[PDB]
Amino acid sequence: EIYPIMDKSSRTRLALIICNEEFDSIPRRTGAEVDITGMTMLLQNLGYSVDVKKNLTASDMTTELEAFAHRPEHKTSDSTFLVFMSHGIREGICGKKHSEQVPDILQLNAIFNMLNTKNCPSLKDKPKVIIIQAARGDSPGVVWFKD
């Protein structure tokens, strides 16, 4: 009852990391380079070929994810990893040109509809790990209690 792994000699594992640190209006995400270096080194040690994309809009993130789903490497792969690192709101991942007046949001539902069986038949019956990092505009998730 375990997911069948592919032989190391003839496999093409592929992973994608989309990170946003430089922005137009919203605060800079400094120290993100350490997060990129950490995740890329980890996934590569796990056998995944890592594609890193820096500072993209919601429209650019949609196209890049759509292009990633139609890669021929997934045909001879057994699993995949998706890493999103940016600001986060109620809807989902923020883009680089996201502001209070002009919204630029990549919806989380669109990510699942991109790697799904219908739009991505190459990753059928294959584990799809989506790691998202989204800092939300709500006070630190801690509450004090009397004991």
């Binding site: 997911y3 792994i5 190391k8 400094t30 120290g31 380079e33 950490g38 995740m39 069986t117 990092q133």
Partner: protein
């Protein structure tokens, strides 16, 4: 030949709902959420499945002392247990 297949299957999302804003002291410091994930991914890769690894990340964040973090595993659609198998 034709066969039925689920549109959404074999998915696992591991995202932090808790805020991870940049600190005033050490501005170039790495993320505590990303850092703790990698630490568990290195030691428990050849012993536990990814869904169980995410639980170990959640178990390590049970008591808040530094940054308050509690990630949530969402849209789990994995029929089987996914072991990574390092070096295989």
């Amino acid at each position: 030949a034709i066969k039925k297949a689920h549109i959404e299957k074999d998915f696992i999302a591991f995202c932090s709902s808790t805020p991870d804003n940049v600190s005033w002291r050490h501005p170039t410091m790495g993320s505590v959420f990303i850092g703790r994930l990698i630490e568990h991914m290195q030691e428990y890769a050849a012993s536990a499945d990814v869904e169980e690894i995410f639980r170990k990340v959640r178990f390590s964040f049970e008591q808040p002392d530094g940054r308050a973090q509690m990630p949530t595993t969402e849209r789990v659609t994995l029929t089987r247990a996914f072991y990574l198998f390092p070096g295989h």
